[PDB]
Amino acid sequence: TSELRICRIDKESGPCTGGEELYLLCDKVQKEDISVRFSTASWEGRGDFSQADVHRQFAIVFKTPPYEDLEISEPVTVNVQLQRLTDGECSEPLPFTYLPR
Amino acid sequence: TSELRICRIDKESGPCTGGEELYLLCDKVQKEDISVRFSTASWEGRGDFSQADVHRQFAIVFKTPPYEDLEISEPVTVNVQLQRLTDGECSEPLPFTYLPR
């Protein structure tokens, strides 16, 4: 009920030793009333996090634009950043590298 | 200004041919006033997405609990899901596999 839904998890595997920090996207949840359950029919484990570790982030889904040179033989890491249409204000850049076919 | 900030991008590389669907987490943005800029000092490209492709997701950061058996020799993909403390209501499970040291 109240629809608990996990949209995604950054990783899909990790050391069985645990302790690996991850993050998951999901629908609305009560930070003062929510936990992450790792489990099997016979075992159960809980992800470790505080209320502060629960954020209300915005997310954008989009397809990457093709690169100017499709014949690059070397990886080319360019910049990616948010830009406001109205004033052309940008955010700090983040990297993303293009690979050759 | 108005602090445009990209928190993360699911991938950090992809084909130079583009067209690869990705997603980025970021602070508040005006879906009717925002764009993604791919660039270099001499080139500029724009991520393709509609207003609908802009979501207001919640995200949880946490460390994975260690697995019951640290001596597993085979990968063990268990279940991960949200669980409400109060009523123990769970969300659909999503997989995550543990690997051996």
Curated annotation (Swiss-Prot), chains A, B:
Give the domain section of the comments.
Answer: Both N- and C-terminal domains are required for transcriptional activation.
Subunit relationships: Component of the NF-kappa-B RelB-p50 complex. Component of the NF-kappa-B RelB-p52 complex. Self-associates; the interaction seems to be transient and may prevent degradation allowing for heterodimer formation p50 or p52. Interacts with NFKB1/p50, NFKB2/p52 and NFKB2/p100. Interacts with NFKBID. Interacts with BMAL1 and the interaction is enhanced in the presence of CLOCK.
State the protein's name.
Transcription factor RelB
Per the entry, what this protein does is: NF-kappa-B is a pleiotropic transcription factor which is present in almost all cell types and is involved in many biological processed such as inflammation, immunity, differentiation, cell growth, tumorigenesis and apoptosis. NF-kappa-B is a homo- or heterodimeric complex formed by the Rel-like domain-containing proteins RELA/p65, RELB, NFKB1/p105, NFKB1/p50, REL and NFKB2/p52. The dimers bind at kappa-B sites in the DNA of their target genes and the individual dimers have distinct preferences for different kappa-B sites that they can bind with distinguishable affinity and specificity.
Entry comment describing in which tissues the protein is expressed: Expressed in intestine, thymus and spleen. Undetectable in liver, bome marrow, kidney and testis.
> Known post-translational modifications?
Phosphorylation at 'Thr-103' and 'Ser-573' is followed by proteasomal degradation.
Compartment(s) of residence:
Nucleus; Cytoplasm, Cytoskeleton, Microtubule organizing center, Centrosome
Query: Which stretch of the intact protein is present?
Result: 278 to 378 of 558
